[PDB]
Recover the amino acids of this structure.
């Protein structure tokens, strides 16, 4: 493992496409070291999930359960991830069509389980 | 106060000018609500300091103690602040000439007292 260093992150969920104006619906902090802590409700599970991506946070998204159905109205919701992970600076975001589509693609992934 | 919402941040100190490659020396998490918590060593004091800027983090820098002296070698160090503060998304950075210059301009400001 080439990546080694501090692991401190902030995750947010934004109502909109990520315009500086957009309302931030909710957010959590996360620190991963001897202890796994923050306002994140499942800190160790979120730390494990982040480590499993090997620093490429697009890997937090997964092919959805094929039996799930979503309405198709466009009401965008954006997830953000910023900070440091195993010593490398992280600045990541992803915009979903609506909350149903977000839930379908973000598994039950501990990272955005807040 | 127009700004209202979640307050969750990550602060880092980087060896260099802030290139994606640069080594992250240290980092802290901070959450400001009923409790002030995170890996930050003085959470409530850092929360108060952030609120005092009214969202403009350039206000974390102050005219230094005029009796301080620093070497002038260029060995840049960059501070970063990312997350959400009273509902508004924050993505801020500042590069100092060296660590002495950083210390002189960042007061004894609780935010970067880690």
């Amino acid at each position: 493992g080439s990546a080694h260093g501090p692991s401190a992150m902030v995750f947010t969920v934004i109502q909109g496409s990520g315009e500086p104006t957009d309302t931030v619906l909710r957010a959590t902090t996360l620190s991963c070291a001897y202890t796994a802590e923050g306002t994140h409700p499942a800190p160790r599970a979120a730390c494990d999930a982040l480590n499993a991506t090997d620093g490429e946070l697009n890997r937090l998204l997964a092919a959805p359960d094929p039996s799930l159905v979503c309405p198709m109205y466009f009401d965008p919701v954006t997830v953000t991830a910023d900070g440091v992970l195993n010593g490398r600076r992280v600045a990541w975001k992803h915009t979903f069509s609506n909350t149903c589509v977000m839930s379908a693609n973000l598994n039950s992934n501990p990272v955005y389980a807040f």
